[PDB]
Amino acid sequence: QPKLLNCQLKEYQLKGLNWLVNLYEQGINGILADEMGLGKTVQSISVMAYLAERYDIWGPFLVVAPASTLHNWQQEVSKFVPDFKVLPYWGTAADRKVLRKFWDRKHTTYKKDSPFHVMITSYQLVVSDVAYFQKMKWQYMILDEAQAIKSSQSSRWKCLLGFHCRNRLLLTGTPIQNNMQELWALLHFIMPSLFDSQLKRLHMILKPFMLRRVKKHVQKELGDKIEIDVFCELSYRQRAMYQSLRNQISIMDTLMNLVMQFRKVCNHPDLFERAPSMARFVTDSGKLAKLDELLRELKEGGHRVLLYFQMTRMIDLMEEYLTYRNYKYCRLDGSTKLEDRRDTVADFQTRPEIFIFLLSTRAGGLGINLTTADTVIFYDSDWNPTIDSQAMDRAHRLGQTKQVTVYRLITRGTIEERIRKRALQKEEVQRVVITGTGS
DNA sequence: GCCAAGGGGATTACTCCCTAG
DNA sequence: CTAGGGAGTAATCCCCTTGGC
Ligand SMILES: Nc1ncnc2c1ncn2[C@@H]1O[C@H](COP(=O)(O)OP(=O)(O)O)[C@@H](O)[C@H]1O
Ligand code: ALF
Ligand SMILES: [Mg+2]
């Protein structure tokens, strides 16, 4: 391993470094599709550290990541390779306008004496600042959570496709997503000459370009997830709403509006129309009634717990209930500013006092480590099993020591069931499409 | 002057059904 | 007669104008 590293790569990660090095030295690009929590970051960083250590390329190295991952990757690269001067390219336009003063355009290869070596950037900024970005030449590009790039009609695909870069990685734990075209977009991006626009063939052609190990094999020290399915019925208020709403199917089947209204009442009828008493507010949502009994048991267990919502208005209502109860919580959603994210995550991870993290599906589902929680609760299931898997794999990562449990509140006899059954069967489709070897 | 808010808008996600190849 | 791409909607996040001390 490159001597720049602070902490030793594990056996499978060293094999992963070797694959990434061979991809580079053979002049080709590939996807590190290693499962969640296997340590894609240390392998990818060790590539950059090898380009530095072996070929004296001290960048310019680009990291693109989701906004909640940015502080995590800045910290971890500082941990694993302190020699790399990070440029944390995020901020307001005026703050970014100052940070551009560190971009040396004269050197196409930076040396250790350089204003920066690794630049870490949001998927948002490579698009908004694209006009600045495409005027620079990158010696290696890493893309975290490459499922962000899965749509070829997305501006972030079109923009990053056109970046002048020698070699590129896609990092993901969930490559397949919804369709073969979404897989192609990841394959075209890495190797545009080969993949310009049956499973026996697929697993043969992709073998050089994707590497994927799984926790069942390499990380079996961590116990399996305990998934639990927690059915509850529509309380009398909810079914009065749901049935009078379903009466619109005397005309329809607007249906795409109705399925969002049906999801709202399955979360809490106050989302549809607010009432009043907090005792009624608990019992007039069946999910919240079953959750209250569950949190009551989990607290006596000492089970620090992550609650995932598909709605923002629900995570508001949720902390009204958490302030009616005695429960100490913290919160993270797509509106919390990035320094607020860093501090809340670090706060939760530091002090065991906090019981609940009210955590968003998307903004709270990727990149970050939450190993001091042990329980994950989906208040809402999601249409994409990869997203719910990403959310639940925030615990159950290489730092975990407690057993992990995953609960899922499903309102029986509602579209909450169709959503979960449709998302669940896609996991089998995605598993079948990964029937071949990933090694 | 300095911080706050939020509010607006463009991008991205994913189902459902129209319409044309 | 199938598929493509438009309609709906809500989360995500940068910009920026208003307001207060
Ligand atoms: N060789 C290693 N030594 C120590 N810690 C590691 C190693 N590899 C991974 N980790 C730890 O694994 C945790 C999660 O890994 P990470 O790479 O963030 O997962 P992902 O593959 O989703 O990015 C991190 O806290 C990181 O410190
Ligand atoms: F694949 Al990750 F945090 F980067 F689960
Ligand atoms: Mg990662």
Mutate to test the pocket of ligand 2, among A13, A35, A36 (most ligand atoms within 8 A of CB): A36
| CA–C1' nearest nucleotide, residue A155 | B11
The total number of residues written for chain A in this structure: 439
Kindly state if the Cβ of A35 falls inside 6 Å of ligand 2. no
- Which pair of tokens denotes residue A263? 């999801």
| CA–C1' nearest nucleotide, residue A336 | C13
CA→C1' distance for A154 and C5 (Å): 15
Ligand 1 atom at minimal distance to the Cα of residue A79: 27
Residue A267's closest CA among A302, A309, A207? A309
CA→C1' distance for A105 and B15 (Å): 45
- Locus of tokens 């019925």: A233
Kindly state if the Cβ of A342 falls inside 6 Å of ligand 2. no
d(CA A311, CA A379): 10
- Locus of tokens 């549809």: A272
Terminal alpha carbon distance of chain A: 20
d(CA A39, CA A23): 19
Q: A39: CA distance to ligand 1 center in Å?
A: 4
In angstroms, how far is CA A356 from the centroid of its own chain? Answer: 19
d(CA A408, CA A421): 13
Note the helical H segments in A34-104. 40-55, 67-80, 93-99
Indicate yes or no: strand B within 7 A of the C-beta of A93.
Answer: no
SS3 content of chain A, % helix, strand, coil (to 5): 45, 15, 40
- Locus of tokens 């501006």: A155
Q: Which nucleotides of C are covered by protein (CB under 7 A)?
A: 7-16
- Which pair of tokens denotes residue A53? 């250590």
Note the helical H segments in A113-254. 125-128, 130-133, 155-161, 180-190, 199-205, 215-218, 236-246
CB A32 within 8 A of CB A209: no
**In what helix (H) or strand (E) does residue A32 lie, and over which residues does it extend?**
strand A30-32
CA→C1' distance for A125 and C6 (Å): 28
Kindly state if the Cβ of A214 falls inside 6 Å of ligand 1. no
d(CA A194, CA A197): 9
Kindly state if the Cβ of A7 falls inside 6 Å of ligand 1. yes
Nearest CA to ligand 2 atom 3: A367
Residue A408's closest CA among A378, A366, A372, A370? A378
Solving technique: cryo-EM
For the beta carbon of residue A197, count every other beta carbon within 10 angstroms: 7
Residue A33's closest CA among A176, A218, A175, A140? A175
d(CA A181, CA A151): 8
Q: A380: CA distance to ligand 1 center in Å?
A: 28
Chain breaks in chain A (C to N over 2.5 A) after: 197, 253, 275
CB A49 within 8 A of CB A164: no
| CA–C1' nearest nucleotide, residue A124 | C13
Q: Which residues contact A243 (CB under 8 A, 6 or more apart)?
A: none
Kindly state if the Cβ of A40 falls inside 6 Å of ligand 1. yes
Kindly state if the Cβ of A36 falls inside 6 Å of ligand 2. yes
